[PDB]
Amino acid sequence: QQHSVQVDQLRMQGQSVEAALRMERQAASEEKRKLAQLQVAYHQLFQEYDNHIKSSVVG
């Protein structure tokens, strides 16, 4: 009788989690983006420093 309503209570809760994993994956990408940027920022800060040393010994 109420075995059907027993399914909804399991279905609806299942998604409630599936959403959280979905949201979690999102923030996970928001951070993957932050790193990637900072990585490039680091690289670039690296090159400019490298080049600066090279230009001080030559001249």
């Binding site: 940027q37 920022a41 670039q44 800060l45 090159q47």
Partner: protein, 165 residues
């Protein structure tokens, strides 16, 4: 490549900011335009006079702590403590000038542009006086008087503290 970062900075640099920035780097240009601004910066880079750590304080002094954090990736809170332990690429003259410029209010500025073949902003003034060899890091008596014409004794006394005695 990395030249794009310098653009995004200009592109987000405020109107009055462009003058503050360009002033600090000694490439001053009255009420510049993007093309003019980025043009100037780009030139300071290709020459090697505009270094990341310079553009950094440069933007810090300018007040764009937000650009520092979101574009250069530095924590302004961090850099503050850092700068408070180094020499500052900017002279105590420029720092005083920038101090004044920031403390001057509408009345004062509006009045300065009046009391003064052209200026339209305090940094524009200091710029000319600098070419007319009236104002300079050597002597700031002119800038010291300018503040007397505007009832800014509190200011003239401040400029007095940051330099002589």
């Amino acid at each position: 490549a990395t030249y794009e970062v310098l653009c995004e900075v200009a592109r987000k640099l405020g109107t009055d900011d462009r003058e503050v920035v360009l002033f600090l780097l000694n490439v001053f240009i009255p009420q510049p335009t993007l093309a003019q601004l980025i043009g100037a910066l780009r030139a300071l880079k290709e020459e090697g006079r505009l270094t990341f750590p310079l553009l950094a304080e440069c933007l810090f002094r300018a007040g764009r702590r937000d650009l520092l954090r979101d574009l250069l990736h530095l924590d302004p809170r961090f850099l503050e403590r850092h700068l408070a332990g180094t020499m500052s690429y900017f002279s105590p003259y420029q720092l005083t000038v920038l101090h004044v410029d920031g403390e001057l209010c509408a009345r004062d500025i509006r009045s300065l542009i009046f009391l003064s073949s052209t200026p339209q902003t305090f940094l524009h003034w200091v710029y000319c006086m600098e070419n007319l060899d009236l104002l300079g890091p050597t002597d700031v008596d002119a800038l010291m008087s300018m503040l007397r014409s505007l009832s800014r004794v509190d200011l003239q006394r401040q400029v007095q503290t940051l330099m002589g005695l």
